[PDB]
Amino acid sequence: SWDVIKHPHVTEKAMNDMDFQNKLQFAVDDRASKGEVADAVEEQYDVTVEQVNTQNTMDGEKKAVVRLSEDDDAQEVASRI
Amino acid sequence: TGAGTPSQGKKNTTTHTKCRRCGEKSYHTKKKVCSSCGFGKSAKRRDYEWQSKAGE
Amino acid sequence: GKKSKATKKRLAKLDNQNSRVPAWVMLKTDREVQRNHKRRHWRRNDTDE
Amino acid sequence: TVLHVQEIRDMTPAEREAELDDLKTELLNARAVQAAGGAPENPGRIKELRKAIARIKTIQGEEGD
Amino acid sequence: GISYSVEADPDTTAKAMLRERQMSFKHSKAIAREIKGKTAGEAVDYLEAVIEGDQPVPFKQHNSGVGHKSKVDGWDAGRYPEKASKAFLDLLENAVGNADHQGFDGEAMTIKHVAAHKVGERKPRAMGRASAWNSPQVDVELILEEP
RNA sequence: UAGGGAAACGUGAUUCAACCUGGGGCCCAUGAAAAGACGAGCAUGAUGUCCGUACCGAGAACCGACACAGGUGUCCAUGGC
RNA sequence: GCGCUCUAAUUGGAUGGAAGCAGGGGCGAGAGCUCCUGUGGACCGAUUAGUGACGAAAAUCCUGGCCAUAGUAGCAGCGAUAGUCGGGUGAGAACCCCGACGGCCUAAUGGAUAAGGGUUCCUCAGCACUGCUGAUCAGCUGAGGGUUAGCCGGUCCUAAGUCUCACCGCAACUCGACUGAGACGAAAUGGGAAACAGGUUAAUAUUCCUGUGCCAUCAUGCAGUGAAAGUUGACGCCCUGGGG
RNA sequence: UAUGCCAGCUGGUGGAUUGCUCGGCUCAGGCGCUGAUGAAGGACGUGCCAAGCUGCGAUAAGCUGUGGGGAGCCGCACGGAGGCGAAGAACCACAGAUUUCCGAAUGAGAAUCUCUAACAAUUGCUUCGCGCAAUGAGGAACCCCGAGAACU
């Protein structure tokens, strides 16, 4: 079977969202809905997912911008991995 | 209005596209039929003897 | 023109196939491999579909 | 290498599922690093994490889980 | 590319070459023809005056349509090939450079031999496009000799 | 006591695109259909997934072998004299 | 009768330098044979008997390469005649950037977009290639990054019409008209539930952020048990008034 | 003696020639079906770095078992970093696991995606329930049954 999360989309812009909007960007599998992407994240990382935006990239992959609840901290999460 | 150069400029209509069945850019999206493999017309694949010399 | 998720994928692959032959391959192959016999310019060339 | 077949078979249907999810998570973090211009890598490993997972799965099949 | 067509003696002579230069081959023939027998230094002063337009290079072979220049002696047509000339100055700067690094008096050395050769075909690269027209590709040898 | 502006942070008028609503006239021409909406209240909460989205849109990003004097639809038709 | 390919039998040459090539000597009427020097660096003959995709000056012959043409034509002509002086960067500057001065475009040379293109967008590093000259510039070369929506579109509906299945025809079908059922058929520009203001990036933005607002569905609770008749969607061409 | 003619010499351009052959061409012997248990074909993925080709299929140049083989190895591909192998790897043989989407393509639609359980369609048997089955498509030519020219 296919995994929902491929890996962390790490780029300057992704950093901003992380350091500024408490947002973590991911490269996910294209058949994954927002809700699926939501769950998967709250699990592999143990947090509260507030909202998730998706975009099908010109790379053949789907990018997801995930915003964590005010409790959890994006920077603090991404730091460990 | 010449049929040449000046009439080439109106050609911005899409017809033949990548074929879901044979992978060729011969799927006529307006006809929904591949001119190469016959997808959309027949279950059997398009093929004729005249595609090669008679004794070959 | 409005594209579909499938079309968008194919284009994406095409853009990717359109990259140099990694610098190292040159050495690994004693330079017998240098040219990407599949370079496709956006203006000069035409992608299928 | 740092994992074998017999050793994978001397596990219980619950120990493999356990070992499996372990590697995946390890793999996933390996990839995460690479994605972020990772350097403290040892490429011959991210390669293994894939083969091992294959093995654990091949076995979950043979042993009936 | 070329190889020195003439034979020299290392003890009393310097060498210099230009490779695949994209510049008129016809202009080179002229310049060479023109500066042979001159002194590395005389050549430099000459070529710079040409690039200036105070001195014209006699076009004796490739002269179709070329207007007459009063400064040409014994001949009539000539021009001021500044591109080809700037390139001969490079060949000289080099020939005179090697000269001194060998305890010679470069500027005072004689141009015993200088000749241009059309080499053709630039040859595309890996990650590089192709040659537009058929710009000529020139090679040019130079042999400096002690007075 | 949103926002925006360095500041002032106007008031009246005429003619009036948009938009709104009417009356008249013509046909050997009669000027789509269906989904949907209304008809048929309120409060609190929850859900609202999937695909497109860059850029060119032309005397260099389109068709014409070309950075081609050609060709190529729509809206801005109310900026001043 | 001379020459070419390969087979056989018989018999020879070659790293103490074969074939080929360049120049040169001798023989034959000649097809041609042979030798010398240089190059080359590994194969090459003779005689006899065989074999045949076996001999070129020609076919507006084919393919490739090359010369003269020629440093010649073009890089002027278009109702859009466009630049100039300073300075910046740079190995290099008429044309890359800043300022001033002078111009060009007004339904377009401005702004937003459909189709089409497909990464051409932004950034960094490049200039061998591309750019009608040059280039430090670039749509070029390479590597990175970039497109975020309940309320913009698709999606749903039906149009001319199309396909599918059944039925029937045909020698037969990937063919063929009718009937029946189903589906498909509109992204600027048909119908249509719902979004505005400001802010924000190198690059997105009614998508992100701040503020305010609206729509649908469902759950719960209250009301109502009215509920389907009807209205709407929903309409031509010409003239005109009023509101604004 | 300019401009220049003829031949040579040195260098070049060009790629003939001679030599060489990892490819062809032809003959010969052997062998010979695949597919709803979803084929053949295609799309898209998959490598530390990976563009092409090959392989493979989300277990992705591979996983397992048996036999062979053997000190080496990580395809073409000779780099860099790293790794694997005496727990016998690489490599070969047979057998098995995995095997994305489109594709006869079969729930329905669609230019390889999408929408809310499916042998679609036509049949046979029938517990008359898709319950048990069949068909469809491919293949170098060869084969069998129909349709059937014209140049000449």
Ligand SMILES: [Cl-]
């Ligand atoms: Cl020339």
Ligand SMILES: [Cl-]
């Ligand atoms: Cl009235």
Ligand SMILES: [Cl-]
């Ligand atoms: Cl004779």
Ligand SMILES: [Cl-]
């Ligand atoms: Cl849109």
Ligand SMILES: [Mg+2]
């Ligand atoms: Mg989106």
Ligand SMILES: [Mg+2]
């Ligand atoms: Mg015609």
Ligand SMILES: [Mg+2]
């Ligand atoms: Mg790219």
Ligand SMILES: [Mg+2]
């Ligand atoms: Mg003249």
Ligand SMILES: [Mg+2]
């Ligand atoms: Mg935009």
Ligand SMILES: [Mg+2]
């Ligand atoms: Mg033309």
Ligand SMILES: [Mg+2]
């Ligand atoms: Mg132009």
Ligand SMILES: [Mg+2]
């Ligand atoms: Mg004999």
Ligand SMILES: [Mg+2]
């Ligand atoms: Mg003749």
Ligand SMILES: [Mg+2]
């Ligand atoms: Mg010719």
Ligand SMILES: [Mg+2]
């Ligand atoms: Mg002339």
Ligand SMILES: [Mg+2]
């Ligand atoms: Mg003017």
